[PDB]
Design a protein around this ligand. Structure first.
Ligand SMILES: OC[C@H]1O[C@@H](O[C@H]2[C@H](O)[C@@H](O)[C@@H](O)O[C@@H]2CO)[C@H](O)[C@@H](O)[C@H]1O
Ligand SMILES: OC[C@H]1O[C@@H](O[C@H]2[C@H](O)[C@@H](O)[C@@H](O)O[C@@H]2CO)[C@H](O)[C@@H](O)[C@H]1O
Ligand SMILES: OC[C@H]1O[C@@H](O[C@H]2[C@H](O)[C@@H](O)[C@H](O)O[C@@H]2CO)[C@H](O)[C@@H](O)[C@H]1O
Ligand SMILES: OC[C@H]1O[C@@H](O[C@H]2[C@H](O)[C@@H](O)[C@H](O)O[C@@H]2CO)[C@H](O)[C@@H](O)[C@H]1O
Ligand SMILES: [Ca+2]
Ligand SMILES: [Ca+2]
Ligand SMILES: [Ca+2]
Ligand SMILES: [Ca+2]
Ligand SMILES: [Mn+2]
Ligand SMILES: [Mn+2]
Ligand SMILES: [Mn+2]
Ligand SMILES: [Mn+2]
Lengths: 232, 232, 232, 232
């Protein structure tokens, strides 16, 4: 089996295992801050530097993966707490969309909310233009921030959020378990054929964004990931 | 929302939160040994004492849950490494099948392999009578040890295995992620309607068994659990 | 060349190849539990029964050796996690010091912290009397628990720890590699002249201890060992 | 801490985590054959694709690493064998020397035996031009195949060799433990300041070479690696 695994309990600038895109910044406490509180339409993305092969065109096999991470979003005075964070998977050539307006695109889609990626979003602002639910929510996105499915959620400022995601290649099921600060859990599942939506080689990462009036602190605190591809 | 969460980093007899059935024993190191290496057709089970309401006959809602646990199976001289462990969900009044033959039944089914339970088994012996795959495997069982679906797996003697389970109520999807000692992960998912197969109040636990010729060390090292039922 | 090698994937009471000293006990899972959670100032040591020839008085040569073992230390209610484990090399007639107070002596030294042995300690309590660093640590001990050199370490309760030790005869260098649960490694190396500190024949083993208020589970799960002495 | 760990129990083509240089080939059993038995002066090198940061110019710290791997060298009819394998560390832009003559250079140095790298060699031919000992041997190389230190060794055709390496950063000690097929171990250690001889980012890998008359099968069977850099 072809396994890729890494664990980050903190991040440091210069680690070749991580690729920073946009307004990302590593705080002295080891945490990654995704957006710049002083920039308009700030977008910051952090990707695992090594491309992962999620499926083989030879065997036709798709990898299963288990990843968990924890983030934190804190409000700042006296800006709107937006827009949030998205854990995504994209082709290895993925770059912040040219002319990105940040905001509701979450740094992974164009103005229409379209892009090439699969991800789980933790949305804190309701963008009618992308058909967002009326409240905070977790959503499964497939090439669009107009989520294929969303579930009500509640982003608590300054609260640490723990997420666990399991992708089972046989059923092509992506299940997410989000553990809120209060102890309750929120789940959302969705069948997504990675082999049909993405190329053999992809990159995993987080992305966050803001707008002119929408800004907040987006922190990634830790990240563990493991993918295993059956090579026969 | 009605939430139930508990976490054991170690166990101990005398703790009212855990029910013990059969040949179960708690080692001084805090681990739970399910089978007695000196008994024929040994069967041991452990359950969270407090029953958990997984679905409501009033609202029709079904709970979502996140649970992870770690176990260890080791070979004992010159007996066969069987049968294994099964994490199950059962009616709150569940007992070890009357006149149980242990072995392939895993302590949850009758001789024909039938029973009232839903579980994830970590099967180390191939019982043709229950249509087992030809190798060690992980399987989803719905009222039968004749798994609804299985996936090839490999039980490594003396190694500590970490399991993460997610049940998404909305899609009724139960997905399992098994992290092997070598870092490799194995996943398996199956849609299972808990509301249809189980009562509103159920019990979670672990069960392991052995036969006359088949025996091995079955250890439960840790267990965290959190279920959240929407009450509206 | 004279080579001594053995491998233990589990132990058992009654195996003549192992010397049990003190409060040591073998669990039904094959783990060796060094101290007794109920005894005051408990001390337990395990030694490979066959004395090993680490140097020849004829050739002047010292043996090189490669050994790796795994252990687990867990906290018990409530109740300090001390004192820890030590992998030591001592005269073949070594016994627990008379009147041993356990505690920071790790069961290998007298009250002043002196003894006849060489070892690697995994110290989880800071004994000022022995000039311990303020935190958990791994130290190289030469005839005293007042370490020749220590390195900061962190003992995680219930975590399985893997250790690899290489002793190079030509350079008389002892290097240790500790793989924590999170995947991180901790190393510490130190030049130690075995021939000048220990007799021709020695025994290898582990020791651990507790005090009145300091107690924890000290377990040895596995241990492989190979030593080679050039006789020419 | 900043850790990088990977584990290969077998290799496969197409894995983005592995870089192939020269005459490397992946056998169906997952083993890597470094040289081409039908080419003159064959050179094959496999590298971990991701560059690793072994020292920070900011903190001045050096990473400690633990790596073990297994290889096999088997004679082929009536050719000399010749030359061998080397485990090396080099600048992230490392390529097979231009106009490499293979043979004694082991695929990492020029004709004079010079190059930019640090490695552990398993040399099976005695090149007087590089001052090789008269017998097979293991040697520590620092920018030259003219080893800083060597130790007598014997390469048994068809034998699976297990190697374990520990690099302690504080002491800058590189310790190697070689386990031969007959159970005997060979060790060799040397102080090497990686910070002084190499840049912050390097790549780890294996290299094997042959000549017109010297050829043999060079196989890398497995390889696990873990390095930790203190970021503070
Ligand atoms: O708490 C762990 C440390 O205990 C020290 O001994 C204590 C003893 O446990 C307590 O009951 C009382 O008598 O005070 C003693 C001295 O502080 C050990 O000396 C030390 O090694 C730890 O085990
Ligand atoms: O016999 C193995 C050694 O060969 C040396 O090269 C030889 C070459 O094989 C032979 O055909 C002729 O050209 O003489 C050369 C010089 O001895 C390599 O240099 C040495 O590394 C071994 O591979
Ligand atoms: O208020 C957060 C919200 O802002 C939207 O963008 C606003 C922008 O902040 C404001 O300065 C401008 O006048 O109008 C824009 C459109 O409403 C973002 O589009 C949205 O994603 C949130 O970030
Ligand atoms: O090999 C373990 C295997 O045993 C089967 O039962 C055996 C039994 O162990 C033996 O004593 C008897 O003579 O034959 C039985 C039939 O094979 C169990 O059925 C199976 O589950 C394993 O436990
Ligand atoms: Ca939005
Ligand atoms: Ca079975
Ligand atoms: Ca101490
Ligand atoms: Ca040579
Ligand atoms: Mn949204
Ligand atoms: Mn089965
Ligand atoms: Mn100490
Ligand atoms: Mn050489």
């Amino acid at each position: 089996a072809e396994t890729v695994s890494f664990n980050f309990n903190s991040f440091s600038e210069g680690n070749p295992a991580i690729n920073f895109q946009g307004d990302v910044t590593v705080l002295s406490n080891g945490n990654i801050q995704l957006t710049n509180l002083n920039k308009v339409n700030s977008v910051g993305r952090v990707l695992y530097a090594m491309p992962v092969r999620i499926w083989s065109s030879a065997t036709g096999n798709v990898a299963s993966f288990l990843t968990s991470f924890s983030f934190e979003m804190k409000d700042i005075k006296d800006y709107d707490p937006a827009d949030g964070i998205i854990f995504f998977i994209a082709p290895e050539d993925t770059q912040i969309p040219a002319g990105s307006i940040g905001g509701g695109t979450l740094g992974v889609s164009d103005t229409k909310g379209a892009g090439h990626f699969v991800g789980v979003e933790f949305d804190t602002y309701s963008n009618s233009e992308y058909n967002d639910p009326p409240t905070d929510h977790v959503g499964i996105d497939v090439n669009s921030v107009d989520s294929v499915k969303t579930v009500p959620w509640n982003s608590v400022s300054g609260a640490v959020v723990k997420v666990t995601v399991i992708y089972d290649s046989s059923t092509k099921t992506l299940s997410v378990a989000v553990t809120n600060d209060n102890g309750d859990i929120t789940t959302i599942a969705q069948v997504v054929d990675l082999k049909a939506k993405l190329p053999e080689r992809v990159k995993f990462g987080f992305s966050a964004s803001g707008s002119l009036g929408g800004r907040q602190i987006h922190l990634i605190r830790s990240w563990s990931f493991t993918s295993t591809l059956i090579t026969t």
